[PDB]
Amino acid sequence: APDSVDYRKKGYVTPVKNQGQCGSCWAFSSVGALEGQLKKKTGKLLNLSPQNLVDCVSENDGCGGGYMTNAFQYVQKNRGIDSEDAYPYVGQEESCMYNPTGKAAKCRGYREIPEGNEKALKRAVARVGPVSVAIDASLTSFQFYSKGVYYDESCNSDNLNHAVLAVGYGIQKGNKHWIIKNSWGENWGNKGYILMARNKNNACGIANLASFPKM
Numbered sequence: 655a656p657d658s659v660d661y662r663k664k665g666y667v668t669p670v671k672n673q674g675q676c677g678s679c680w681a682f683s684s685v686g687a688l689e690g691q692l693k694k695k696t697g698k699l700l701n702l703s704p705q706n707l708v709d710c711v712s713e714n715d716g717c718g719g720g721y722m723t724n725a726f727q728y729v730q731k732n733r734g735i736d737s738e739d740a741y742p743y744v745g746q747e748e749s750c751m752y753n754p755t756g757k758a759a760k761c762r763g764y765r766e767i768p769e770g771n772e773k774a775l776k777r778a779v780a781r782v783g784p785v786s787v788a789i790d791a792s793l794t795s796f797q798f799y800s801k802g803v804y805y806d807e808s809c810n811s812d813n814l815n816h817a818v819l820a821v822g823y824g825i826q827k828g829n830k831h832w833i834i835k836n837s838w839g840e841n842w843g844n845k846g847y848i849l850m851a852r853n854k855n856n857a858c859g860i861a862n863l864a865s866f867p868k869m
């Protein structure tokens with residue numbers, strides 16, 4: 655595995671989205687991982703539908719939260735997920751209206767990174783591409799983040815409450831980090847992104863609930 659890799663520079667990552675006032679971070683995280691696997695398989699980069707997931711994943715709770723693995727399982731069983739255009743995002747729960755004509759990707763299962771193993775997460779990001787992860791993003795310091803490598807001692811690895819996407823890893827002036835795509839628009843953080851401490855005892859629980867879809 656390389657010392658540093660950034661999948662944004664490989665054309666694997668779509669623009670940063672804004673989830674608005676709906677607890678749908680898990681859907682944006684899932685779509686992000688699926689988008690990366692689609693680029694690798696087909697050569698094409700396109701926006702897939704978070705709304706499809708919000709409405710249709712019955713084992714999740716819509717705008718009230720959910721798990722990424724449940725979203726990958728749904729896409730597999732359903733044998734498809736719509737593009738953003740065929741099932742646009744409205745930031746509220748509605749009845750499931752999957753449109754088979756708008757199908758833009760599929761899923762053939764998912765795999766999980768060994769809990770807490772940051773080296774296994776590094777090797778997965780390096781081998782597979784963007785990986786869905788869960789973190790403690792409850793701190794005020796996370797909310798107002800601007801630039802640099804994010805670390806806060808009061809972050810709790812047991813309190814996973816926010817779903818994001820790891821689009822790579824690296825080292826910024828001696829400090830090892832994960833490159834993290836958020837879903838709060840381009841005006842949050844650094845153009846929608848945050849660098850989070852890597853190899854600092856699994857800070858904010860970055861490697862506690864990581865997974866990627868298979869295609």
Ligand SMILES: *[C@@](O)(C(=O)N[C@H](C)c1ccccc1)[C@H](CCCC)NC(=O)O[C@@H]1CN(C(=O)Nc2c(C)noc2C)CC1(C)C
Nearest residue numbers: 675676677678679680717718719720721788814815816817
């Ligand atoms: C998610 O982080 C999100 O959408 N966050 C933004 C900021 C937001 C929150 C609320 C309104 C509008 C925007 C989403 C928030 C859901 C809360 C309503 N988080 C999410 O889906 O996290 C999932 C669900 N998890 C979970 O239930 N874990 C958990 C908690 C919080 N307490 O006890 C448990 C077992 C974890 C996970 C990150 C997978």
